[PDB]
Design a protein around this ligand. Sequence first.
Ligand code: ZN
Ligand code: ZN
Ligand code: ZN
Lengths: 92, 42
Amino acid sequence: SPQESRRLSIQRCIQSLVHACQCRNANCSLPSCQKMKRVVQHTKGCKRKTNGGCPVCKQLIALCCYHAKHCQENKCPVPFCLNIKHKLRQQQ
Amino acid sequence: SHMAPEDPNEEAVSQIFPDSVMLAVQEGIDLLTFPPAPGSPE
Ligand SMILES: [Zn+2]
Ligand SMILES: [Zn+2]
Ligand SMILES: [Zn+2]
C-alpha cells in the first residue's frame, strides 16, 4: 500500500487546517498552526488563486477537498469545507 | 510550559509548506492517493 504515507500526510495536515480555522489567537506558538497561518493568509488575499491557476491556493484547497469529502457538519469551522460539500452535491 | 514544545503532525505540514519558505508555490499534492469507490462498471 504505497498510498498510505501520502494519505496519512494529507489527514495529518488536515488536523492543522481545522486547528488554524478555530484557533482563538493569530499569534499561536503551535508549530503546525504557525505553518498553516502562512497558506491561510495567502489564499484569503491572493488576487490570482485557483481561478487564475495559483499553485499555493490549490495545495490548501486539495486538503479542504479531502476533508469535505468525508465531513458532514453543516457549520464546520473550515471556510472551504462547506463550499466543497455544496459542490459535491452538484456532481451526483 | 511558557511555549509550545512540538506537534507530531508538523512533519506532514513541513513537506507541503515549512516555517522557512512557501514550498506550496512549487509542491504538488497527489490528492488521487485517496481510497476508491467500493465498486465500478469496469
Ligand atoms: Zn493555534
Ligand atoms: Zn495564491
Ligand atoms: Zn468539515
